[model samples]
Target: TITEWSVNMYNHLRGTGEDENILFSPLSIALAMGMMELGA
Candidate 1:
């Protein structure tokens, strides 16, 4: 997911702006996952 998420920038050109706008940052996802991992 790291690699795929990193390439999400191209989504801006795919005409998925409405959906792309809600894309989450890699770091934010990492942070959230980190918390979930530790939270468990």
Candidate 2:
């Protein structure tokens, strides 16, 4: 579910903004959340 959320958030972020160079890794984001979840 976190991965799904990550993708939706990514799409939302990419959609609402001025034209500019966008960069990110949804997998990394998901991984971060996963690690945090595991740690907590």
Candidate 3:
């Protein structure tokens, strides 16, 4: 459910107005989660 998780994460992390410039890389997070999944 990476897509679902990514959506939730993006929604939660997304900021308002000026803070919108803040970056959130779902690909990187998904990759890391994949690594963790493999390791686990």
The whole-model lDDT of each prediction reads 0.65, 0.77, 0.74
> Which digits, one per residue and each the tens of the lDDT, describe model 2 over residues 1-40?
7567767776776787777667788888777888899968
Runs of candidate 3 exceeding 4 Å displacement: 1-4, 14-21
Model 3 lDDT per residue over 1-40, tens place: 8678777876766654456555578889788878999967
Local lDDT at 23 for model 3 = 58
Q: Give the 10-residue window scoring lowest on summed lDDT in candidate 2.
A: 1-10
TM-score, model 1 to reference: 0.40
User: Which residue pairs show backbone clashes in model 3?
Assistant: none
Which regions of candidate 1 are displaced past 4 Å?
1-22
- Tens digits of per-residue lDDT, candidate 1, 1-40, equal 7767657755644665455434447777678878899958
Reference-based lDDT, residue 5, model 3: 74
Q: Which of the two, 2 or 3, has more lDDT?
A: 2
Residue pairs clashing, model 1: none
